[PDB]
């Protein structure tokens, strides 16, 4: 067969150790989920890092920098995101993984909800990808491996993520990925039905109004790996409806510089037939982790953050924001409480 005796025994033991790690991780998650912080004047507001509202760099007045997310309650209501948003705070307080951004404080006032997270200073993968143009296959693989491990973790907790895209992946000071934005994350032991996500990254079963499951995240991983290695996504067009036509068609074309191993992996991730899509089969995530394109990946070394990253962003000190774009800076909290009943639990 493909593996000799030593190799097969090593892989077997590695897979059983993953099961052991995940069982403990699910126990910690459920304990925190069952039994889950500050105020606006505790922080000096510095500048706006990104755009329901804005994310701002703040300095806690222990001197540490954080990214403070500000959500207008009326906006959350108008976009019908009330349950998605209360759930995002609950998920972020309860999970724990090296590639998931860490929530440190939460609170609210008359008009806004606030989530204070660790500041990830290296900027969005999106910016780096558009600037460099495309990532080499080893560079794309280093990032992909972190997403594989992160989805393996989240899916073991029965959480579907549903918003993978380079815009939602931050690069930290060591060049590793931080997943942000859990507004669409949900516990789904079986199926769920909400039409949500980003057009380029939607699995066909979402577009076709089906009940769907965590397999949509593995489709989205295929889209991400393709966009990282090509510089552009596998399905695009002027308007979303034409993008959906390409996604459901069952056809994908690849750049001539893609390796044969990469094309084979992507044809198995970007698989319209759910009975054939990697991540959705009897062997689960092992079909992905054991694929030839990942043969050089040391999964435990990635998890321990012992692999040298291909890209280390510029860090000129604490509070440096040079990796983020510039946005217009605004100041206001209403004298009356907005949407009090809808957000009582936040």
């Amino acid at each position: 067969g493909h593996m000799g005796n030593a190799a097969a025994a090593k892989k077997g033991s590695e897979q059983e150790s993953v099961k052991e790690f995940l069982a403990k991780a699910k126990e910690e998650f459920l304990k925190k989920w069952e039994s889950p912080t500050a105020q606006l004047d505790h922080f000096d507001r510095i500048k706006t890092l990104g755009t329901f509202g804005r994310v701002m760099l703040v300095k806690h007045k222990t001197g540490n920098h954080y990214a403070m997310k500000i959500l207008d309650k009326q906006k959350v209501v108008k976009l019908k995101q009330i349950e998605h948003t209360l759930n995002e705070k609950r998920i972020l307080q309860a999970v724990n993984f090296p590639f998931l951004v860490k929530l440190e404080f939460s609170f609210k006032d008359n008009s806004n909800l606030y989530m204070v997270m660790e500041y990830v200073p290296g900027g969005e993968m999106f910016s780096h990808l558009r600037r460099i143009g495309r990532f080499s296959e080893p560079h794309a693989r280093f990032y992909a491996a972190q997403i594989v491990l992160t989805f393996e973790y989240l899916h073991s907790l029965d959480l579907i993520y549903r918003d993978l895209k380079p815009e939602n992946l931050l690069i930290d000071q060591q060049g590793y990925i931080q997943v942000t934005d859990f507004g669409f994350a949900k516990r789904v032991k079986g199926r769920t039905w909400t039409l949500c996500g980003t057009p380029e990254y939607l699995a066909p079963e979402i577009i076709l109004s089906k009940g769907y499951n965590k397999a949509v995240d593995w489709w989205a991983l295929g889209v991400l790996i393709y966009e990282m290695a090509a510089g552009y996504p596998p399905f695009f067009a002027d308007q979303p409806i034409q993008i959906y036509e390409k996604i459901v068609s069952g056809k994908v074309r690849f750049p001539s510089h893609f390796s044969s191993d990469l094309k084979d992996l992507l044809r198995n991730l970007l698989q319209v037939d759910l009975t054939k899509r990697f991540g959705n089969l009897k062997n689960g995530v092992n079909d992905i982790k054991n694929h030839k394109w990942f043969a050089t990946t040391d999964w435990i070394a990635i998890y321990q953050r012992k692999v040298e990253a291909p890209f280390i962003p510029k860090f000129k000190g604490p509070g440096d924001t040079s990796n983020f774009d510039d946005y217009e800076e605004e100041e206001r909290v209403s004298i009356n409480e907005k949407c009090g009943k809808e957000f009582t639990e936040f």
Binding site: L79, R130, F184, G197, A230, F236
Partner: peptide, 20 residues
């Protein structure tokens, strides 16, 4: 090229989620 078609699409910037 496919890259030129990507530029022509107008969807090269940060992309919004559906609910926007």
């Amino acid at each position: 090229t496919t890259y030129a078609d990507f530029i022509a699409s107008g969807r090269t910037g940060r992309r919004n989620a559906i609910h926007d």
